[PDB]
């Protein structure tokens, strides 16, 4: 009595996966779809990185001493550190976050002169917080005041037409003095006003004296369009203006760069390298990343139902 049989393979102990109707059912082979192994470095290989070190991202636009070496740069991968600072002298940017969001995808920046020549005022206003080898204030800015103490500052109009291919990033500052008296000493008595106008933008600023500070503001000037500054004091004038290069990623991290691993997905704690559809590492990422899931492990059957002998 001859016979032939039909059957399938099995291993001693397979791996447990979940199906629609059963939990932890053993199969011959399965593979992981959720990446949990993190590379604790910023993988810069192939990219041209910019570790901003002690320079805050926004510093690059106004130019405090910590950013002297980043006033112009080119990068497809910008790495912000926690110890970076945008300022040298009290004050915040308005919209600081969207400006970061814009700079993080700029591909770097390049400065160009606006060519403002000033008549009948003092240009060389300085602070000891900003003083350095180069100049005694923000590198890209000019602190404008009266020819003498308490002297009247003239009503003034300055305009800049963007002569370029792409939109310009225009930064100006408003000076809030330590006191009314101090505001008088730099710009003279009288109520002061700053108005900035392009064909998109229209905004009025009054100094609010009381606690020494310089608050900065910004807009995006259309190519061929003109901006207009009218001011009778407390005005921090741009000397240069930035132009964005190409396309970059912006990472906030405390991990060191490593120029010998290819990275596409980044987060506060390094790099995720994975052709896996999902990741459990970090929910806040930047680049081409696996989707963040809250599960540690999702095993996907690469084999059949394991039935031991």
């Amino acid at each position: 009595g001859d016979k032939i049989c039909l059957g399938h393979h099995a291993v001693a102990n397979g791996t447990k996966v979940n199906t629609l109707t059963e939990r932890g059912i053993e199969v011959v082979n399965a593979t992981e779809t959720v990446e949990t192994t993190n590379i604790k470095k910023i993988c810069t290989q192939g990219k041209r990185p910019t570790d901003l070190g002690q320079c805050g991202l926004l510093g690059t636009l106004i130019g405090p001493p910590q950013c002297d070496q980043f006033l112009e740069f080119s990068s497809d991968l910008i790495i912000e550190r926690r110890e970076g600072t945008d300022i040298c002298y009290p004050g915040r940017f308005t919209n600081e976050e969207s400006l970061r969001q814009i700079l993080r995808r700029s591909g770097g920046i390049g400065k160009e002169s606006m060519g403002f020549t000033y008549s009948g005022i003092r240009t060389n206003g300085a602070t000891s917080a900003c003083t350095r080898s180069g100049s005694s204030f923000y590198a890209e800015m000019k602190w404008l005041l009266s020819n003498s103490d308490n002297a009247a500052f003239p009503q003034m109009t300055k305009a800049y037409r963007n002569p370029r291919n792409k939109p310009a990033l225009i930064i100006w500052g408003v000076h809030h003095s330590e006191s009314v008296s101090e505001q008088t000493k730099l710009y003279g008595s009288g109520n002061k006003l700053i108005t900035v106008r392009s064909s998109k933008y229209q905004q009025s600023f009054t100094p609010n004296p009381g606690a020494r500070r310089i608050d900065f503001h910004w807009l995006l000037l259309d190519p061929n369009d003109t901006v207009t500054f009218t001011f009778n004091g407390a005005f921090i004038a741009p000397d240069r203006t930035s132009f964005f290069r190409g396309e970059s990623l912006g990472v906030q991290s405390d991990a060191p760069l490593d120029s010998s691993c290819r990275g596409d997905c980044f987060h506060s704690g390094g790099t995720i390298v994975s052709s896996l559809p999902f990741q459990n590492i970090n929910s806040r990422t930047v680049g081409k990343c696996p989707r963040y899931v809250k599960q540690k492990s999702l095993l996907l059957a690469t084999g059949m139902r394991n039935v031991p002998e």
Partner: protein, 175 residues
């Protein structure tokens, strides 16, 4: 276990069938022997490689930072962002859960299918020359040496060649 072969009528798998996925095991006058099946192993594997192509190495979506982790952004917009992110997490954790659980349901049943298909292939080959024992084996009603066993495995078995003997072994009554 939809097709009732694996974890159904086939009692168990063979721990010593490393030559492939689905196989044969003969018992003739010349002893015992195991050989594997290329046609049906490959049919299954190709349909499993297919699933991996679909999920592994897919082009990821572009991601950009909307939060700020160094200097915290205004509270209200921070909560809207946080809320939105957590909805995504809920959505994608749902999808992944289900994607995998479904692909795993299909993988197991697709595998069962190939076993059942091969079994039905062999069942039809042998025709009247054998009977099913209910455990996945065929009681062959004629002498089938190593060459004969080979012909079955590689689908060249000629039932008309052995029919006459087999019937004399199956119908054990007068007509």
């Amino acid at each position: 276990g939809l097709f009732g072969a694996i974890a159904g009528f086939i009692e168990n798998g063979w721990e010593g069938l490393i030559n492939g996925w689905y196989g044969f095991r003969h018992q003739n006058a010349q002893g015992e022997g195991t050989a594997a099946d290329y046609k049906s192993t490959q049919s299954a594997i190709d349909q499993i490689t297919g699933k991996l192509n679909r999920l592994i190495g897919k082009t990821n979506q572009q991601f950009e930072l909307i939060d700020n982790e160094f200097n915290e952004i205004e509270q209200q917009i921070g909560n809207v962002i946080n809320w939105t992110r957590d909805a995504m997490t809920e959505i994608w954790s749902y999808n992944a859960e289900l994607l995998v659980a479904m692909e795993n349901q299909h993988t197991i049943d697709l595998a069962d299918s190939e076993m059942s298909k091969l079994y039905e292939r062999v069942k039809k080959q042998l025709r009247e020359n054998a009977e099913e024992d209910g455990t996945g084996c065929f009681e062959i009603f004629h002498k089938c040496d190593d060459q004969c066993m080979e012909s079955i495995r590689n689908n060249t078995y000629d039932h008309t060649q052995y029919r006459t003997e087999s019937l004399q072994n199956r119908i054990q009554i007068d007509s």
